[PDB]
Design a binder for this molecule. Structure first.
Ligand code: ATP
Ligand code: ATP
Ligand code: 4OG
Ligand code: 4OG
Ligand code: MG
Ligand code: MG
Ligand code: MG
Ligand code: MG
Ligand code: MG
Ligand code: MG
Lengths: 257, 257
């Protein structure tokens, strides 16, 4: 007979994008279970690397080799940083903040910490100043197809000379062509890097009025990329949860076998 | 005249371990400022890697090469995981938890997530099962010399065959000798890896009664290492804050120049 909706959901959990009727549910499930176990066995036998960790290391190598300084800043940040970013109750992000204690929150973005590093490093480093960070960011989200509440962001910034829209688009282009990800750029200037209807990045060509609140008075360019969305596109995951920090999926493979 | 306590504090911020009277504060400060700027310039010109990120990549390579599977699990975990770990109000850790919303918290440890992966991977992977994770952990702490509220932990576990105290001590020994860190092991069995009076790790030889609550019924060995404490020892930092995710220090160098 026909597969139930619940049975189809179960199979889709076990179904990989590269997988290719009269067979009952138990046979279809048994076949997929066998395939997914072998996938995990192959990873365990060979590379043993996590997709998220591996992507972070690859992105790190890319930006270090292009002269960007690797930053590891706090994930737990002051609540005042959020207000200082021009985030008031009349914006969407104000309601998306994970508050911790009275004075802190989980960072929903990388810009405040990177802003602070630009200002401080300006007193020590030659022009131009190039920095980047990869790490966890947190936002309360209502959706679940393209959004995670716990995700990983790449953020990079260049300050001083060479901060043009052309140079920014060049870095973005080299980056995504390096990863093998198809894209289009749509758009101080605010640009969005799109994969179909999926936003991979928001990019900015400074200066912008916000800079003054952070002690920045130089031209700058930068962008923020979601690593899970990059993984989702590269590995053709139907749902972004396959690319997340998770106990339910490893490298897009269901751990409930 | 004599340096004030405040002036000495200022200098100690700028002072590096490898640095070597009648000179006034302003001269001493100016000399150190010049040295620290050059240090940052040298990093920026050459390697451009963050110590914490670099250590994580080195540790990752070590365990992957020895057959351990790289795990990236959620940092935001259910509060029930804490209770299930046998953490009640009569223990110290109960008061150290960063609570988020009503049902979640920032993980103070890696064991609950690694426990879950051991159980799930047992249905797919051959014996023995070897996994590890590196990532942020959070604990409210009263001290500040050897403790951070936001820190990074290495956790590894092996389940099944070869789970002996000897094998556990062998992995620990090879690991720390690889990093070039002096240590002594002091001590199911609970072992502590010490550097002088500083605890680098707590290690465990299972099985332990707690395993049943997590669906584990096999022998296992494992340990948890603090990456910032490893950095502190390796780079001879006087205060652990020099090794933390920070806006005040980069690779042990003050960013307030
Ligand atoms: N909840 C989330 N889950 C996964 N990735 C995210 C999330 N929020 C943002 N990102 C990624 O971070 C990048 C930069 O953050 P930004 O604030 O510009 O996103 P956004 O415009 O809020 O995204 P969206 O419009 O899709 O909600 C985005 O391009 C996206 O790839
Ligand atoms: N607050 C902290 N800051 C930095 N590192 C930590 C912190 N708490 C734990 N660690 C590291 O994690 C490892 C394993 O965690 P564990 O719970 O065994 O530590 P602990 O016994 O609470 O440490 P301590 O006794 O020093 O407070 C420790 O050996 C330590 O290196
Ligand atoms: N608004 C997001 C993404 C972003 C846009 S420009 C930019 C420059 C540096 C880091 C992040 C970003 C953030 O602040 O993380
Ligand atoms: N209690 C700490 C450290 C630890 C001891 S054995 C162990 C095995 C795996 C992961 C972590 C640990 C934790 O749960 O993270
Ligand atoms: Mg959004
Ligand atoms: Mg958007
Ligand atoms: Mg955007
Ligand atoms: Mg403790
Ligand atoms: Mg202890
Ligand atoms: Mg301990």
């Amino acid at each position: 007979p026909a597969l139930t909706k619940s049975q189809t959901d179960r199979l889709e959990v076990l179904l990989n994008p590269k997988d290719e009727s009269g067979k009952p549910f138990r046979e279809l499930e048994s076949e997929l279970l066998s395939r997914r176990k072998k996938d995990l066995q192959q990873i365990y036998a060979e590379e043993r690397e996590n997709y998220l960790g591996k992507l972070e290391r690859e992105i790190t190598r890319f930006f270090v080799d292009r002269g960007f300084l690797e930053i590891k800043s706090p994930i737990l940040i002051p609540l005042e940083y959020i207000e200082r970013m021009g985030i008031d109750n009349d914006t969407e992000l104000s309601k998306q903040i994970f508050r911790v204690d009275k004075n802190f929150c989980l960072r929903p973005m990388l810009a405040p910490n990177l802003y602070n590093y630009l200002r401080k490093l300006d007193r020590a480093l030659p022009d131009p100043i190039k920095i980047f960070e990869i790490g966890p960011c947190y936002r309360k989200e209502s959706d679940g197809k393209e959004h995670l509440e716990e995700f990983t962001m790449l953020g990079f910034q260049q300050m001083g000379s060479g901060c043009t829209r052309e140079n920014l688009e060049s870095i973005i282009t080299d980056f995504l062509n390096h990863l093998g990800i198809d894209f289009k750029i749509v758009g101080g200037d605010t640009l969005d890097v799109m994969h179909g209807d999926l936003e991979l990045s928001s990019a900015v060509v400074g200066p912008i009025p916000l800079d003054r609140e952070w002690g920045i008075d130089k031209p700058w360019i930068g962008a923020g990329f979601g690593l899970e969305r990059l993984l989702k596109v590269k590995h053709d995951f139907k749902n972004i949860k396959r690319a997340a920090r998770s106990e339910s999926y490893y490298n897009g493979i269901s751990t409930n076998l």
